[PDB]
Structure formats: structure tokens, C-alpha cells
Amino acid sequence: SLPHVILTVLSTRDATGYDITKEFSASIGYFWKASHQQVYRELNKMGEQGLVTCVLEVYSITQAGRSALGEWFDQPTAHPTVRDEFSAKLMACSVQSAEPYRLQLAELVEESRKLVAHYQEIEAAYYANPAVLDKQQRLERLTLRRNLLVRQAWIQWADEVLAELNAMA
Amino acid sequence: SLPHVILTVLSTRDATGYDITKEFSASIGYFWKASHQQVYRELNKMGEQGLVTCVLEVYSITQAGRSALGEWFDQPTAHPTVRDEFSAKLMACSVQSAEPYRLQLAELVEESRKLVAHYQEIEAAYYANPAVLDKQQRLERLTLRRNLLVRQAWIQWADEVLAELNAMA
Structure with a gap:
């Protein structure tokens, strides 16, 4: 779902809330439609869930986030x-x-x-x-x-x- | 939705609960997947809604059922x-x-x-x-x-x- 789509982005590299929304209005928009709003809201829920954290040096995926992405991935996807x-x-x-x-x-x-x-x-x-x-x-x-x-x-x-x-x- | 799919059947002619379920395991199954169960349950809800009635001589569509089918039909359907x-x-x-x-x-x-x-x-x-x-x-x-x-x-x-x-x- 939306959070896994977001976790995927973060799995390659950390990114700001802007980097992420830029994906949804770009390549991610080829297969998943979500507004900047929905995205920010999901990122928020993910923070409270401990799937992502924040840095300064920027959002980053956590081990829990990585575990959930893997679990999602292994689950069979059907029509x-x-x-x-x-x-x-x-x-x-x-x-x-x-x-x-x-x-x-x-x-x-x-x-x-x-x-x-x-x-x-x-x-x-x-x-x-x-x-x-x-x-x-x-x-x-x-x-x-x-x-x-x-x-x-x-x-x-x-x-x-x-x-x-x-x-x- | 399911009830409109059922109302469509009844709009051409009255039919028994069996005639209707036979459609869902036949031609209707080409575009709408529903179990005999779900179908009977929906037919039940439709009766309480007054969209369909029963006869002996057999389910039959009512004016309300016809009105709802038309309303559904006029509403824009999008991707x-x-x-x-x-x-x-x-x-x-x-x-x-x-x-x-x-x-x-x-x-x-x-x-x-x-x-x-x-x-x-x-x-x-x-x-x-x-x-x-x-x-x-x-x-x-x-x-x-x-x-x-x-x-x-x-x-x-x-x-x-x-x-x-x-x-x-």
C-alpha cells in the first residue's frame, strides 16, 4: 500500500519530504496516485509507527520499516x-x-x-x-x-x- | 454495484433465485464476481429496500428498483x-x-x-x-x-x- 510505496523510496536512500513527494508527481505517478497531502499524512503515521525516522545533516527508513517492506514483498500479490x-x-x-x-x-x-x-x-x-x-x-x-x-x-x-x-x- | 447488476437481470424479466444465481456463474461472471451466497444476501437486502418483490405464479423488479437502476446508469462511471x-x-x-x-x-x-x-x-x-x-x-x-x-x-x-x-x- 501507500506506506510500502514510500518505504521503497527510502530503501535506496534517505530523502526529504520534498524529494519523496517529487517522486509521486513523477515516476511513482505511473502506478500509484497519491496527493502530496496523503503522502505527508502517511509519512506522519509512519513516524509514529517507527517505520521511518528523521535526521538533519531528511527522512530515513528504520529496521522496522525495512522489516515491514520485506514482509509486504514476500506476501503473494494477486489480481x-x-x-x-x-x-x-x-x-x-x-x-x-x-x-x-x-x-x-x-x-x-x-x-x-x-x-x-x-x-x-x-x-x-x-x-x-x-x-x-x-x-x-x-x-x-x-x-x-x-x-x-x-x-x-x-x-x-x-x-x-x-x-x-x-x-x- | 452488486444490486444494480442484479436489478439489470430483473429489468428484462422476472426470475427465480436460481435463475439469477445461474447468471452469476455464467455470462455475468465475465465481469462481476459474486458467490451464490452474496447474491442471496443482496436479494434479501433489496427486498427490505423495496427494490424487488416476490411472486408465485419468482423475484420481480419494482418501480423503486427501476428508478435506482436508472439513477445508477445516469451517474458517470470513471476509471x-x-x-x-x-x-x-x-x-x-x-x-x-x-x-x-x-x-x-x-x-x-x-x-x-x-x-x-x-x-x-x-x-x-x-x-x-x-x-x-x-x-x-x-x-x-x-x-x-x-x-x-x-x-x-x-x-x-x-x-x-x-x-x-x-x-x-
């Missing part, structure tokens, strides 16, 4: 249960005016298209060739690639639905 | 916030033994492959040609297609990660 809202709404189109849905779908497709374009721009600019990227960069690249492939798959699906919603009426 | 656990674990591979992760990933890929095969078998057998399918079938077909495209996209991604986890070590 979230399937309960697709878009599919659920689609099925109701047999008894509801498909108008509202069709517009809400077409709308989210365009945004998705914009988001895919954004990610592709970023990949070409900083993650075009893995072979020349550091380990940390290859990892970031992969998290970026996930949104891309999935989002693209969803757009492909959305278009298929958008088509059926016409050939039926 | 769930991005907080990818697999990506989160991947990033921790820079500071953790990538061993446990790599095995948990390879494992879920094979299952995903099995699931994709399953869905493809179903599509060829009952949803191969939309043009010959009824409206209700074209809709089911589309919900089935969503798991397929997305799951396939995730497998493509997982393989990319599985590769990097080698070329780095």
Missing part, C-alpha cells in the same frame, strides 16, 4: 477481483437508454487516448532504449509500460463497444 | 484510481530479492494464460459472429471480450517484466 463497472453498465443497455452510457464511454476513451499519448511521449523521451538505461530506469520504464498496454487494451475494447452500440440501434 | 500492486512490488525489486516476486509473477501469468484460453474457447463456441447473435448476446460477448483484451495486455506486460528481471541479474 483484484473482477467487478467491471463499464461492463455492468453495458449490460444494462438492454433495458436502459444507451444514450447516456455511449456519451460517458466516448468521453473516457478520448481521455484515455490523451493519457496514452502522454505516456508514449514520456517513453520516447526518457525510456526509449532499456539497454542504455540504469536498473532503476528500466524498472520505472516497466511501470510506465503497464499503463500504456492496459490503457491501450481498454481503448481497443471501448471502441468495440462504441461500434456495437450503433449497429444495434 | 478506478491507479494504484498498481504489481508495479509497486516491481519497484521494490531494486532493494529486495527479486526472487519471490519473479516467482509470484510467473505464477500469475500462467493462470492468466489459462483464463485467456478459457475465454477464447467460450467466444469461439457461442460468440464467434456478432452478426448472427441477438442483442443480449452481443452485449455478453463484449463483456467477455473485455477480460480477454485486458488480461492479454497484462500478460504481454508481465512477460516484459519477467525478461528485465533476468537481463539485470
Whole structure:
């Protein structure tokens, strides 16, 4: 969860509250959405939990923090249960005016298209060739690639639905 | 949510508690996972809410149920916030033994492959040609297609990660 995402950052090096939030508005934003607020609040809870401490010379991960990160890591991670809202709404189109849905779908497709374009721009600019990227960069690249492939798959699906919603009426 | 998924069924025709659960272990299972238990329990809550009633001649949707389904339908449906656990674990591979992760990933890929095969078998057998399918079938077909495209996209991604986890070590 959020604290493990934060512990991961600190596991490589100590960092200020700003360094950390800069990650969330950068590479971490490719797979985990959290506001600077939420982040500071979590960092706070983590301090009381003893998972992180403060230094002057700056947040630093503690042995407890390291232990929790490892425990999290070892736990099996599985696919979230399937309960697709878009599919659920689609099925109701047999008894509801498909108008509202069709517009809400077409709308989210365009945004998705914009988001895919954004990610592709970023990949070409900083993650075009893995072979020349550091380990940390290859990892970031992969998290970026996930949104891309999935989002693209969803757009492909959305278009298929958008088509059926016409050939039926 | 679950009750709207159930209301949708009843919006086309009345049905017994068995007819409804049969949907969840069938086409509805393509996009919404719920146990017969959960279903019966929800049907119960819906009765007390007056969204559904009982008949002899069998559950039937009420005007309130119809109103709630419409209200649900009109509400904008958006993409769930991005907080990818697999990506989160991947990033921790820079500071953790990538061993446990790599095995948990390879494992879920094979299952995903099995699931994709399953869905493809179903599509060829009952949803191969939309043009010959009824409206209700074209809709089911589309919900089935969503798991397929997305799951396939995730497998493509997982393989990319599985590769990097080698070329780095």
C-alpha cells in the first residue's frame, strides 16, 4: 500500500519530504496516485509507527520499516477481483437508454487516448532504449509500460463497444 | 454495484433465485464476481429496500428498483484510481530479492494464460459472429471480450517484466 510505496523510496536512500513527494508527481505517478497531502499524512503515521525516522545533516527508513517492506514483498500479490463497472453498465443497455452510457464511454476513451499519448511521449523521451538505461530506469520504464498496454487494451475494447452500440440501434 | 447488476437481470424479466444465481456463474461472471451466497444476501437486502418483490405464479423488479437502476446508469462511471500492486512490488525489486516476486509473477501469468484460453474457447463456441447473435448476446460477448483484451495486455506486460528481471541479474 501507500506506506510500502514510500518505504521503497527510502530503501535506496534517505530523502526529504520534498524529494519523496517529487517522486509521486513523477515516476511513482505511473502506478500509484497519491496527493502530496496523503503522502505527508502517511509519512506522519509512519513516524509514529517507527517505520521511518528523521535526521538533519531528511527522512530515513528504520529496521522496522525495512522489516515491514520485506514482509509486504514476500506476501503473494494477486489480481483484484473482477467487478467491471463499464461492463455492468453495458449490460444494462438492454433495458436502459444507451444514450447516456455511449456519451460517458466516448468521453473516457478520448481521455484515455490523451493519457496514452502522454505516456508514449514520456517513453520516447526518457525510456526509449532499456539497454542504455540504469536498473532503476528500466524498472520505472516497466511501470510506465503497464499503463500504456492496459490503457491501450481498454481503448481497443471501448471502441468495440462504441461500434456495437450503433449497429444495434 | 452488486444490486444494480442484479436489478439489470430483473429489468428484462422476472426470475427465480436460481435463475439469477445461474447468471452469476455464467455470462455475468465475465465481469462481476459474486458467490451464490452474496447474491442471496443482496436479494434479501433489496427486498427490505423495496427494490424487488416476490411472486408465485419468482423475484420481480419494482418501480423503486427501476428508478435506482436508472439513477445508477445516469451517474458517470470513471476509471478506478491507479494504484498498481504489481508495479509497486516491481519497484521494490531494486532493494529486495527479486526472487519471490519473479516467482509470484510467473505464477500469475500462467493462470492468466489459462483464463485467456478459457475465454477464447467460450467466444469461439457461442460468440464467434456478432452478426448472427441477438442483442443480449452481443452485449455478453463484449463483456467477455473485455477480460480477454485486458488480461492479454497484462500478460504481454508481465512477460516484459519477467525478461528485465533476468537481463539485470
